[PDB]
Amino acid sequence: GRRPARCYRYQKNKPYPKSRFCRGVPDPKIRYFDLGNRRAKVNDFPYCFHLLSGEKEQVSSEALEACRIACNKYIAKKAGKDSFHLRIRVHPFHVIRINKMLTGMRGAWGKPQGTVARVSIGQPLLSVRCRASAKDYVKDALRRAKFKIPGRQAIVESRNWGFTEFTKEEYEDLRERGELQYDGNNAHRISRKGPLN
Amino acid sequence: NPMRRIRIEKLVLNICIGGEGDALTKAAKVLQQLTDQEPTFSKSRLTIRGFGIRRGQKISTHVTVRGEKAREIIERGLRVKNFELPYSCFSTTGNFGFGITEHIDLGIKYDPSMGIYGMDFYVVLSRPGFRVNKRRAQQQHVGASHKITPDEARAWVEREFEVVY
């Protein structure tokens, strides 16, 4: 509420997270950064889709909440809730401050009125892992999210299997070798250093 | 090995009387009477209203007896416990501890003005080779191969104090 957000957009002030010094911050709107099947398995959901920033803006936490709901609702209607795992990769730590409109610039240090998240170019603001059922639906679902975030953003299918660092070709190669492992939502390349038993 | 032998290093009898003043003094005499060794009082690290404690209040009295004098006291006390101890009682390091209620059962005269005094007997065990963790020079800790094990201690007490587990 208040501030059209054009005022807090391009990265300007030095990072101001809520430490001991900065207090009084009202709670951030976005709280659910993990959605869908957070409890999923590594082999499943081998298609990964990402929304990637083309600007250095500061996307508000209230703005981040809207993008989370828009993506979650569309994928859920089109395909099962358990056909995708959604991760909001930017977290709203930076604290934005307001000089109450009620004197003037004398004593203008602003009381905290908000929480915003700084997104550099090439940072995936949002990413999703989907099984083949939603391999199609997620792409336009993420476009319906793109509008809520300001600026220009690109939807790019990760060529890396799932959220795993390895490419889809590597994940299957490591799995067929047997070098691959499961850590619930992730896999490790070798795990070959430590004492042999 | 003769140098892998187990000996008792020390026995501490501790009486925490609990903010009674003269009673801890009478128990200072009690520890002195039963061990022929002057006692040392204790002070509170934490002060608590519920326990009747204030910082620096005298709550405990403890003498450390090392030698044949001590060994005799452990066995007088264990006769009170009927030579039986828990298998759990043994600490991981290799020491055990029991507690007696009533100084009289040890074989001390109960003049009844002096109060019945519950005591706690903790027995630390050592082995020839343990003057490496108390010496000012070369204070390196004892190796695990030489260190006492809870299992070793349980058997040593069985092969000596002959207590049930």
Binding site: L196, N197 | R136, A137, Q138
Partner: protein, 289 residues
């Protein structure tokens, strides 16, 4: 279950203490104070006196600490005392005063090795009798050559009244090396009026002589076990005092160093594994399992 206090982090932050301190043999704070010399003195050497007691041998060396190493000028040990008369009680209080006579006279003789006129040793004979006379070697007029100034090291040993280390320093001062000291941590100091006799008795072990009588009265069997070398060698309770005066005398006459033979019985030296040996070991536990 239980957290591991020694994390890969605890290990990373750990600063090893200095090698000598991690072994425990050197008090760095004390020796830093001892090695301090006013910078105006510049490169003039400062000489330290080291007395460390081992299980059976009181060890004395006079050393100067250089920037790259430590340099001992001369050293005497209780192992040498059988050459000059005493074969038993090599660590007794009387051995200490006698080792420091060797320590002080070995040096006074070596400083006077080339002088040949009025030398270091020639100027200061030192106390011919063995007595607690508060002897100080620098109270004299001196001038030209003066007493070598060393500083006593008690090391990690407490400076107890009556300590063996303290006897050694009185032995060096009696030889004539000026080790600064106050006769307060030596036996027999009772406030004013030092009892010279008590030090004289201790440096001529009569205390052992009385203990020998206590065992010869209470139980002869314990006295064979607690005094085996003393019984085996002909060291009588009465004769030891005569032996000590000869031991002090032998040292003063010839205190020079004679070297016992050295056979270097070096050990097996099992070799470290090679990378292929290290890799085959990995293979065996890859084969078994």
């Amino acid at each position: 279950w239980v957290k591991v206090q020694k994390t890969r982090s605890y290990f990373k932050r750990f600063q090893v203490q200095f090698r000598r301190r991690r072994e425990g043999k050197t008090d760095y704070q004390a020796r830093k104070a001892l090695i301090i010399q006013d910078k105006n003195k510049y490169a003039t050497p400062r000489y330290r006196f080291v007395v460390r007691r081992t299980n059976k041998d009181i060890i004395c060396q006079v050393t100067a600490a250089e920037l790259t190493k430590d340099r001992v000028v001369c050293a005497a040990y209780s192992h040498e005392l059988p050459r000059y008369g005493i074969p038993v009680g090599l660590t007794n209080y009387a051995a200490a005063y006698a080792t420091g006579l060797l320590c002080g006279r070995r040096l006074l003789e070596k400083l006077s090795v080339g002088i040949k006129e009025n030398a270091l040793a020639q100027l200061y004979p030192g106390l011919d009798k063995a007595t607690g006379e508060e002897y100080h070697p620098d109270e004299n007029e001196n001038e030209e050559v003066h007493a070598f100034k060393a500083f006593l090291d008690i090391g990690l040993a407490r400076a107890s009244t009556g300590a063996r280390v303290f006897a050694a320093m009185k032995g060096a001062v009696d030889a004539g090396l000026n080790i600064p000291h106050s006769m307060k941590r030596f036996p027999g100091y009772s406030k004013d009026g030092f009892d010279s006799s008590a030090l004289r008795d201790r440096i001529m072990g009569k205390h052992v002589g009385d203990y020998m009588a206590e065992l010869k009265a209470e139980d002869e069997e314990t006295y064979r076990k607690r005094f085996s070398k003393y019984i085996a060698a002909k060291v009588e309770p009465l004769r030891l005092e005569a032996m000590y005066t000869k031991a002090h005398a032998a040292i003063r006459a010839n205190p020079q160093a004679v070297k016992a033979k050295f056979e270097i019985k070096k050990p097996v030296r099992q070799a470290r594994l090679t990378l292929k040996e290290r890799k085959e070991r990995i293979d065996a536990k890859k084969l078994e399992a």
